[PDB]
Amino acid sequence: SDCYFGNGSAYRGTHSLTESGASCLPWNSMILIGKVYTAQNPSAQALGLGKHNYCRNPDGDAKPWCHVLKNRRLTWEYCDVPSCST
């Protein structure tokens, strides 16, 4: 939607931008091999983790995040989705 409710675990929108203004890596990236929260996750479907780079909260984190490259380094970061409450 236009916003996430609670911690956004049910969020299934198209926001693909982090707090720092960086665009998310897609969940199916080759770069995420070894990670748990990828498209190859056994529950990828249930989590909204697929061949996209949309902001998700598959792990009970605070709000929707995504994996990103922070100057060639692989990290993750919260995304820019406004809370439905803000």
Q: Which residues bind Cl ion (CB under 5 A)?
A: 35-37
Dig out the tokens for 35 from the structure.
Answer: 């990670």
**CB of 35: closest distance to Cl ion in angstroms?**
4
Q: Residues near 24 by Cβ (< 8 Å), separated by ≥ 6?
A: 16, 17, 18, 53, 54, 55, 66, 67, 68, 79
Measured from the CB atom, the residue of 4 and 37 that comes closer to Cl ion is 37
Query: Could you give the CA distance from residue 5 to residue 3 in angstroms, rounded to a whole number?
Result: 7
Residue number closest to Cl ion, CB atom: 37
**CB of 57: closest distance to Cl ion in angstroms?**
12
**CB of 12: closest distance to Cl ion in angstroms?**
19
Measured from the CB atom, the residue of 42 and 86 that comes closer to Cl ion is 42
